[PDB]
């Protein structure tokens, strides 16, 4: 399994604990982009996994230097690939405005 610290962060993200997540990432910034193949579970995956995305939580991850270049689910989809699969222009636009890469 992943570290207790990463599991603690991911739980706080899933639970919508904005202030706790902010504090964890202030104190332990290197957690922000840690992902676990083959599920690709990660702080970001906990946000993007949801049919209705919590953009406050996504903004918090962005403030703490989350990136959008690694896969975010067990399909090995990047954030942009997920947006494409879901035909979600809201997510597409957010990702583009945050320099997310687009695969070929």
């Amino acid at each position: 399994i992943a570290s207790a610290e990463l599991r603690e962060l991911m739980k706080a993200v899933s639970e919508g604990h904005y202030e706790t997540v902010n504090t964890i990432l202030d104190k332990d910034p290197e957690l922000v982009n840690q992902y676990a193949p083959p599920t690709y579970d990660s702080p970001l995956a906990r946000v993007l996994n949801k049919k209705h995305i919590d953009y406050k939580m996504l903004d918090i991850l962005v403030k703490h230097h989350v990136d959008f270049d690694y896969p975010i689910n067990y399909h090995k989809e990047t954030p942009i690939e997920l947006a494409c699969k879901n035909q979600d222009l809201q997510l597409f636009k957010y990702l583009v405005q945050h320099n997310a890469p687009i695969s070929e």
């Binding site: 990463l6 982009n33 840690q34 676990a36």
Partner: peptide, 5 residues
């Protein structure tokens, strides 16, 4: 990046 597991 890939987490230490």
């Amino acid at each position: 990046v890939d987490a230490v597991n």
